[PDB]
Every structure is written in structure tokens, then in C-alpha cells.
Design an enzyme around this catalytic site. Structure first.
Site, mmCIF file in Angstrom:
data_model
loop_
_atom_site.group_PDB
_atom_site.id
_atom_site.type_symbol
_atom_site.label_atom_id
_atom_site.label_comp_id
_atom_site.label_asym_id
_atom_site.label_seq_id
_atom_site.Cartn_x
_atom_site.Cartn_y
_atom_site.Cartn_z
ATOM 1 N N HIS A 187 -85.207 -40.168 42.297
ATOM 2 C CA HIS A 187 -85.088 -39.244 41.135
ATOM 3 C C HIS A 187 -84.489 -39.961 39.922
ATOM 4 C CE1 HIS A 187 -81.159 -38.163 43.055
ATOM 5 N NE2 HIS A 187 -80.792 -38.339 41.773
ATOM 6 N N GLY A 194 -73.431 -38.156 38.733
ATOM 7 C CA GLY A 194 -73.379 -39.625 38.651
ATOM 8 C C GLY A 194 -73.247 -40.311 40.009
ATOM 9 N N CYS A 241 -75.101 -40.119 42.812
ATOM 10 C CA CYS A 241 -76.258 -40.362 43.704
ATOM 11 C C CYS A 241 -76.452 -41.840 43.925
ATOM 12 C CB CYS A 241 -77.518 -39.677 43.215
ATOM 13 S SG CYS A 241 -77.388 -37.902 43.452
#
Ligand code: Q5T
Ligand code: Q5T
Ligand code: CL
Ligand code: CL
Ligand code: CL
Ligand code: NA
Ligand code: NA
EC number: 3.4.19.12
Lengths: 306, 306
Positions: free
Chosen positions: B41, B143, B145
Site C-alpha cells: 500500500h 507511519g 506499517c
């Protein structure tokens, strides 16, 4: 969101851990610059730890009575001195991985990460607090001495604890990195006891603010209290008295959440008198006291600026 | 002695963390050899995370639409592919600090350390468990991930988790390092729910053995139970049924302590029916389920062989 017992990343401290052997005693050292720091009892034999004479023991030794291994690679000792209860060993090589660092002496109630080490090798990391009785509730076995406690601020490692011993109650005692004991303890195998411990009230309040930040709100009530009426209840449950300075350092969390410190005190008073009724707060049935106000802001926001 | 929520030392994983930016999306990557792994993503804009088309999004990108920074030093991307829900970014430099490692997919009930990262930088370490519903009770913000979960065996890092999302209940979902989701979750901002969670029975029993190893014995009783009569009680309190395989893996702790597994089950049955009566076990008022049998042996003995 979420709230865990969170430690600092340990890599900067891992790069400093070495093994120190003197005779029939091996433990962990902290290698910063061209100095290795370690508990002075490395200079004892097991048969001589009940009431040792470190002064005598130290003069009888030379630099070649100290094997320092950084993993596999021996470090030549070129000097040796004692400050309080730590040995400083001068070596011929500065540690290339020495982090930016300070030696700090912390206050009771303050938290830190411990890197538990054996054979000069990192084994595990956990978080704990300097208890009001100057002990820590650690996890330490034979071989662990010289393991350190630390906080990280920016790229700066503040070393605050070096492990020396376990008391009969299964709690831990040690020094700052200048070798000074936290609490009224000495490095000998004698019958020492800690003060009765107390609950760290300001940390409990910080952790109720973390619960509100994380959406856990059931325990908030419509009441207020005075500081003295709060202490009247809290001290009955073995809580440290709340001081105006502790109210002050809760201000930022109070402003963030919109809950006045003495309103949060009212919620804690009702929790102490009534209990939780099978409910939990952030997955705990006990009121947790090993997060400082700073710990809560760091975990809930500050980390996003790493 | 002592028993803490203990994580693995994080330094080996810290040396692998980098930042990955693609457009108006920044997160964390894992740099092993000449590959950087990260959640797919990163190739979305915020405006396009509700039901994205990763296939389209990926072909539209080139290697120069990916800024990889290892601290300050940019890494040139020379190739890009998608496996399940991870992006693999081929770079021109193998990581000199790549540890010995494996990608492993863990089972529900198994524990791991999480290194929580922001801006490609390590911020905190904590321990958690793959819950029976394939969520974890983490601590993660915007922030985070690409932060990973891992175990260390010898000098070998077993990576088991990469963080992708938070569910509305405040629990976390992610993938193995081949990009496969734990649980029935997809990487889109849709209304997904986890199964109702259960208590990890074998871990509760492991943690009662840790309490006995550490001298906490008050809850031991003179009774025994059959496995079925145990499950009859335990399942009433939302415990996973205990299986013969789980009895088997408790054997080493049973032998160490001299307490038969079904005798320990009898003690747990009485704790579930009667409660603790204001008592605690290793400083907890709840029965803890995020230590495996292996975790207990590691912390109580195995670490001294580090
Ligand atoms: C790290 C070390 S290492 C090398 O393994 O890496 C470990 C970490 C341990 C851990 N699990 O956290 N640390 C240690 O092993 C420690 C090293 C020590 C050097 C500090 N040791 C310990 O932690 C041990 N803990 C203890 O021993 C603790 C606290 C130190 N205490 C106890 O457990 C309770 C023991 O009490 C027993 C009674 O002891 C004596 C009472 O003290 C009072 C007397 O003191 C004065 C002594 N007097 C003399 O010596 C006089 C001699 C001459 C005059 C005599 S002779 C004839 C006359 N008659 C008399 O009556 N007197 C006259 C441990 C290992 C956890 C248990
Ligand atoms: C790490 C990322 S980073 C970049 O910050 O480092 C973070 C870590 C977050 C953390 N705190 O742990 N992760 C994220 O930000 C996640 C990234 C995602 C890409 C996964 N996001 C999240 O974690 C967010 N979490 C969620 O969003 C969660 C679980 C994913 N869900 C919720 O919170 C609940 C939201 O539900 C809202 C309802 O959503 C829609 C319902 O779903 C069913 C519909 O699905 C099919 C969609 N259909 C279409 O699009 C059809 C379109 C065309 C046909 C249409 S048009 C006209 C017709 N009429 C119709 O009815 N249909 C027809 C977060 C950020 C924590 C909230
Ligand atoms: Cl306090
Ligand atoms: Cl189970
Ligand atoms: Cl609890
Ligand atoms: Na106070
Ligand atoms: Na089971």
C-alpha cells in the site's frame, strides 16, 4: 492505538556489551570509548563474596588478570581502577560502535529498559521502574551482572543502572555507572532487606491518561477531590502521597485529554474504594505504575517523530 | 529469578530497517541482502486506499518512483515486484548488516517481539502473541506499517510478521514476509471484523509453571482432573480447549517442577471458578496468556547459555 510495556530499541547498547573474566568469576562489561565498566565483584572468587576486601583484591591484580572478549576478539587491558562499586578497565582499542551517551542517576518512579546479558551476549530486553524502595522488579539469573538499564533520548543513550545482586524477596539491586548503589545496599552476600515498597501514584495517573487516549473511559466519574482528600484515600492503599510537583508534570496529559488532574484523582479514588468489578483497564485488572507521564506521551505520539 | 514480558534484543532487526516513499505515502521497509520488503500500500495515495487496484498501481510505477533511505543514504531501486501484499524492491547494494534469517509463518498462540518503527527508524520494542483470531494486541500509530515481528534462535532472526492495519476494535493485522495475511483480512479500508478472541490455555499453564519456578506456589492444590473435565470448565471462561498436543509440550516444565500437567489443570480450574481473592501471581491479577512454554524455559534458564 494500543498500549504495551514498551522498551527502547536495544541495538545501541548491544554494541557495547562485552564479557569480563577475572579468576573463577565471569560477568558482563560495558565498553564505551577505550574503557570497559563492570561490577567490582568480578575480582572475587565465589568462596570470598560474603565480606570481601575489594581494595586488597584490586592491588593484587594486574591488567593480564582480566580477559575481555568482544564476541571472539580479546581486548587487551592496559590499566585498571575502581570507582565506588564499578571496575574501570582501560583497553587499547576504543569501541567503534560507542553511541552518543550520558551517565545519569535516576529518581524513584522513573522507568528504563534493561538489556539482560550472559557471557557478554544480549539475551532479552524488558522495561522496569526504580521502585520507591530503590529496588527493581527485574528478571536476572547467575551470570547477568553488568547488564545495564538505559533510556534513549534522540541518538543519546542515558545509562542509569548496572546490575549487581538479588535480595531474598526476589527483587534486584545495583548501581549508577559511577558505581554508586541505588538504595542502602552494599555488594556483599549479607542479610540486607529493602524498605516496604509503595505504589507510584503519579505513574498510575499517567497510565489512566493513556487508557483515556486509547478510548478506555468507563472509570471516569463526575466528581472532583482535593489533593489532601485524595492522599487520605491513596495512602490507605499504600500509594505514595501525590505532590503538587506530580500534579504539575501531569499537566500536558490533562490538557491533551481535557480531564483535570484532580478529576482523574477522583476517578482513581473510586477505583481504589470500589475496585474494578471484573472490568479491566488497557487489559489489566491491577492499576499499573511502571509508565511515567513521559512514557505515555512517547508511546502515544512522540514515536511518530523518530 | 523474576519474570518479565521479555522481548528479544532488537539490534539485528534495527540494522535492516529503512524508509520507503512512493508518492504521498511513506512507511518502513525491511532491507535483507539486495531486497527491501514493505507493504504494497506504499503505492497508494490516501484518497485511494478504500478499494485500490494494486496490479494497475504497480505497472504505472518505475524504480525512480521509490525513494529508499537507509538513514541519510538513498538506496537506488533497480527492480520492483509484488508478492501477495508485499512489495519487493531490488536495490543496487546488499545490506552489509543482513543477519542470518528465515521467513516463518507462525501459529496462533505463538509469541514474537515487535520493533515498532516510524520514518524507517526504530522507536520501541515489545512482546506479543498471535491471538487465536489472527489479530495482535499491538501498539501502532500512523507511519508504523512495515514494522516487523520476529523471534531470534541462535544468531538466526525468524521474521514472522509485517504490520499493515488496525481494525476498529483497536487490534492489529498484518502478513508473513511472503505477504500472506494472518487471518481473513485484506489490505483495504473496508469494514472487516476479527472473530471473537479466546484465551490461550497452554500459555496460561506455561505461565503458572513460570510462577512455580519463581517461588509463587499459593494456587497449587491437592486435586487432579481429566482433560475433558478441565475443558468443561475452561471453555465456560472462554479458554481454548486444551489438546493432548498442548499437554505434550508442557511435559518439560512438568518434569522441571514436579507438577503433573493435569494437576496444574486442577489448580487452574479452581482459579477460574473461585478467582484469586485479591491475590496476584507474578504481579498479575489476571491469568497471563502471552508466554509460550518455550518462552518460560528461555527466560528461566536458556538465556544463561547466550
Ligand atoms: C551477578 C554476578 S555474576 C558473577 O553471576 O555475573 C549476580 C546476579 C544475581 C541475580 N540473580 O540477580 N549477583 C550475585 O551473584 C551477587 C554477587 C554479590 C557479590 C553481591 N550475589 C547475590 O546476588 C546473592 N544475594 C545475596 O547474597 C543477598 C544480598 C546480597 N543476601 C541474601 O540473599 C541473604 C543472605 O544472608 C545470609 C547471612 O549473611 C550474613 C549476615 O550478614 C551480617 C554479617 O556481616 C558481617 C560479616 N562478618 C564477618 O565476616 C566477620 C569475620 C571475622 C570475625 C568473625 S569470626 C569469629 C567471630 N564470631 C562471630 O560471630 N563473628 C566473628 C545471591 C547469589 C542471589 C544469593
Ligand atoms: C500503516 C500505514 S502507514 C503509511 O501509515 O505507514 C498503518 C498502520 C495503522 C495502525 N494504526 O496500525 N495502516 C493503515 O493506515 C491502513 C492502510 C490500509 C491500506 C490497510 N489503514 C488502516 O489501518 C485503517 N483501518 C481501516 O480502515 C480498518 C480495516 C482496514 N477498517 C475500519 O476501520 C472500518 C471502516 O469501515 C468503513 C466502511 O468501509 C466500506 C465498507 O466495505 C465494504 C465495501 O467494499 C467494497 C467497495 N466497493 C466499491 O468501491 C465500489 C465502487 C464502485 C461501485 C459503487 S459506485 C455507485 C454504486 N453504489 C453502491 O452502493 N456501490 C456502487 C485505519 C487508518 C486505522 C482506520
Ligand atoms: Cl508518586
Ligand atoms: Cl491453547
Ligand atoms: Cl493484571
Ligand atoms: Na507523588
Ligand atoms: Na489447547
Amino acid at each position: 492505538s494500543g498500549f504495551r510495556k514498551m522498551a527502547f530499541p536495544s541495538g545501541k547498547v548491544e554494541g557495547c556489551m562485552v564479557q569480563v573474566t577475572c579468576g573463577t568469576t565471569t560477568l558482563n562489561g560495558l565498553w564505551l570509548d577505550d574503557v570497559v565498566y563492570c561490577p567490582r565483584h568480578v575480582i572475587c572468587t565465589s568462596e570470598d563474596m560474603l565480606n570481601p576486601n575489594y581494595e586488597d583484591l584490586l592491588i593484587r591484580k594486574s591488567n593480564h588478570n582480566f580477559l575481555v572478549q568482544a564476541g571472539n576478539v580479546q581486548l587487551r587491558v592496559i590499566g585498571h581502577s575502581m570507582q565506588n562499586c564499578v571496575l574501570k578497565l582501560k583497553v587499547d582499542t576504543a569501541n567503534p560502535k560507542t553511541p552518543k551517551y550520558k551517565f545519569v542517576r535516576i529518581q524513584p518512579g522513573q522507568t528504563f529498559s534493561v538489556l539482560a546479558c550472559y557471557n557478554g551476549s544480549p539475551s532479552g530486553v524488558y522495561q522496569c521502574a526504580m521502585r520507591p524502595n530503590f529496588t527493581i522488579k527485574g528478571s536476572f539469573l547467575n551470570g547477568s551482572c553488568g547488564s545495564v538499564g538505559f533510556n534513549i533520548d534522540y541518538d543519546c543513550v542515558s545509562f542509569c543502572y548496572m546490575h549487581h545482586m538479588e535480595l531474598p524477596t526476589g527483587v534486584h539491586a545495583g548501581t549508577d555507572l559511577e558505581g554508586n548503589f541505588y538504595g542502602p545496599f552494599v555488594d556483599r552476600q549479607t542479610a540486607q532487606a529493602a524498605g516496604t515498597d509503595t505504589t507510584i501514584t503519579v505513574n498510575v495517573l499517567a497510565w489512566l491518561y493513556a487508557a483515556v487516549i486509547n478510548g478506555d473511559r468507563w472509570f471516569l466519574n463526575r466528581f472532583t477531590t482535593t489533593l489532601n482528600d485524595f492522599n487520605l484515600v491513596a495512602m490507605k492503599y499504600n500509594y505514595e502521597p501525590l505532590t503538587q510537583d506530580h500534579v504539575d508534570i501531569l499537566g500536558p496529559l490533562s490538557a491533551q485529554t481535557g480531564i483535570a488532574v484532580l478529576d482523574m484523582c477522583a476517578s482513581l479514588k473510586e477505583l481504589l474504594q470500589n475496585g474494578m468489578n471484573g472490568r479491566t483497564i488497557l487489559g489489566s485488572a491491577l492499576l499499573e505504575d511502571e509508565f511515567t507521564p513521559f512514557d505515555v506521551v512517547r508511546q502515544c505520539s512522540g514515536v511518530t517523530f523518530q
